[model samples]
Target: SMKIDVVTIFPEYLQPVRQSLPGKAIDAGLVDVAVHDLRRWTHDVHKSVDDSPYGGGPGMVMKPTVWGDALDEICTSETLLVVPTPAGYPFTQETAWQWSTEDHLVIACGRYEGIDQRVADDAATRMRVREVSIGDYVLNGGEAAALVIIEAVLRLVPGVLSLLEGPSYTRPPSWRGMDVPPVLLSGDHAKIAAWRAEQSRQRTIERRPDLLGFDSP
Candidate 1:
C-alpha cells in the first residue's frame, strides 16, 4: 500500500484532494493519505509559519524552522519528499510513474514567497527529494499543485485505474450527427489497438502539441 502525507498551513485547501481520488483510494485500502497542519510545528502563540524575507521581498517567506521540524518528524530514509514550486523541475508522466512505485511520499506545500531554501537543502540530506512544478505559471500556493501530483501518481498505482487510461466510450452510437469510430467495434483486436493508439496521439497533438514535440498534420 502507498502512504502519502501532506503538510500545509492551509489544511482546508486539501479538503477537495481528500474527498476525491485519494479519498476513494484510501477507502478502498489501495492507499493511505493524511493531511497535517504545519502550524502544529509552530511554538509561538500566533502559530507563525512565515516571516519577512531577509532580502526584503514583497511577500513573506515560509520559515525554515517550522518546515524543518515538520520534515524531521514526517520524513524517513524511505520517504520521497515532494516540494511543489514554479521554480522546480517540470512534473511529467515519468515523474508520476516513478513516484507510484514508492512506498511513502511526503508533500510539503510552500506558500507565500515560498519555503526557506534551507528546508530543501536539509531534506536532501535525509530522504529522496524532488521539487516539481505542474506548469509554467505560478500559483498562490502549492496545495493545488500537490493535489495534481497526488492524483497523477495514485492513478498509476496497480488496480487504482483498472482500465489503465485506455480510451473510454458511452452508449448511443450516433449523437448530434457524430458516430463512434467503426474500428472500435470491428472485432479486430489489432486494428482496435492501433486505432486507440492513433486516436490518443491525435488528441494529444490537437490539444497539447508540446507533448509530441512537433506540429500536427
Candidate 2:
C-alpha cells in the first residue's frame, strides 16, 4: 500500500481528507496516510511558521526552519514530495494514473503568501517533486488541493475503483445537453471503450483545452 504524508499548518483541516474517498481507501488498506502538524516543528517563542516576506512584500512567507526540519525527518527514498500551488503543473487524468504507482508520497500544504522557496528547493533535491494545481483559481489552503489530488489518484488504483464506472471517465452529459452515446448502453465492450475515449477527449477539449491533444490508446 502507498503511504502519503501530509504536512500543513491547519492539520485540523485534514479531517475532511479522512472522511473522503481517500479516507475510505485508507480504511480498505489500499493506502496508508498520515497528517503532520507543521506547528510541531516550530521552535519560535510563539511557534509561528511564517513571517513578513523580505523586500517588503505584501504577505508573509512560510518559515523555512520549520518546514526544513519536518522534511528531513519525514522524507525518504519512498517519498514523492508534492507542493501544491496555483502556478503549478495542471492536474489531469494522466497525472493521477502516474501517481497511483508510487509506494509513498509527501505533500506540503502552503498558506499565506506561500511557503518559503528554500523549503521547496530542498524538497526538490531529495525526492520526486511536483507542483500541481487543479485550475486557474487559487485555493484558501492545501487541504482542498490535497483532497482533489487524492480523489483523482484513488480512482486509478487497481481494485480501489471500478474500471468502467469511475467518474473521471463516466460522468454523462446533462439531459439538456448532448445525450450519452448509444454505444455505452449498447453493451459492446470494444465499442464502449472507444466511445469513452472520444467522450473523454471531447469533454476535456470543451472544459479544459489545455488538457487536450493527447492521443488515446
Candidate 3:
C-alpha cells in the first residue's frame, strides 16, 4: 500500500481527489491519502505560514518554520518528499512511475513567491526530497499540480485502472459523419495492437511533439 500525504494551506482545494479514482482506491484500501492543513503547524494566533523575504521581494515566501514543523511531524525515513514549484525538476510520466513505487509520498504545496529553500534542504537530511514541476508554466498554487500528479501516479498502481491502455469504441461506432476505424472492429489482436500503437504515437506526435524529439511542424 502507498501512503500519500499532501500538506497545503488550502485543503478545500484538494476535495476533488477524494471524489476521483484515487478516492475509490482509498476506499478499496489500495492507497491512503491524507490532506493536511499547513496552518496547523503555525505558531502564531493568526496561523500565519508565510512572511516577507529576507531581502526585498515581490511576494512572501512560505516560512521555513511552518514547513519544518509540518515535515518534522509527517516525514519518515521512507518518505519521498516532493515540493512542486516552477524552479523544480520537470515532472514527467517517468517521474510518476518512479514515485508510484515509493511506500510513502509527502507533497508540500508551496505558495506565494515560494517556500524558503531551507525547508527542502532540511527535508533532504531526513528523507528523499525532490522538487518537481508539472510543466513550464506557473500555477496559482501547487494544489492543482499535486492533483495532476496524484491522478497519474494512482493510475499506475496495480488494480487501480482495469485497462491501462486499451483502445475503445462505443456501440454507435459512427458518430455523425465520422466512423470508427475499420481495423479496430476486425478483431485481429496483433493488427489491433499495432494499430493502437501507431495511433498512440501519432497522437503523441500531434499533441506533444517534444515527446518524440521532432518539431510540431
Superposition TM-score, candidate 1 onto the true structure: 0.86
Local accuracy of candidate 2 as per-residue lDDT tens digits, 179-212: 6666766789998777777766666766556545
lDDT of 3: 0.88
Q: Put down candidate 1 lDDT per residue, 119-214, tens digits, no spaces.
A: 999889878899988999989999999899999999999978611224677778878988888887678999988888877787777766767786
Off by over 4 Å in 1: 159-169, 182-195, 215-217
Worst 10 residues of 1 by lDDT: 161-170
Residue pairs in collision within model 1: none
Each prediction's TM-score versus the true structure = 0.86, 0.77, 0.89
Higher-ranked by TM-score: 1 or 3: 3
lDDT of 3 by residue, 66-176 (tens): 999999999998899999998899998889988888899999998889999999888899889999899889998899999999998998988775112334687777899
Candidate 3 ranges beyond 4 A from true positions = 161-168, 188-194
- How should the candidates be ordered by TM-score, best one leading? 3, 1, 2
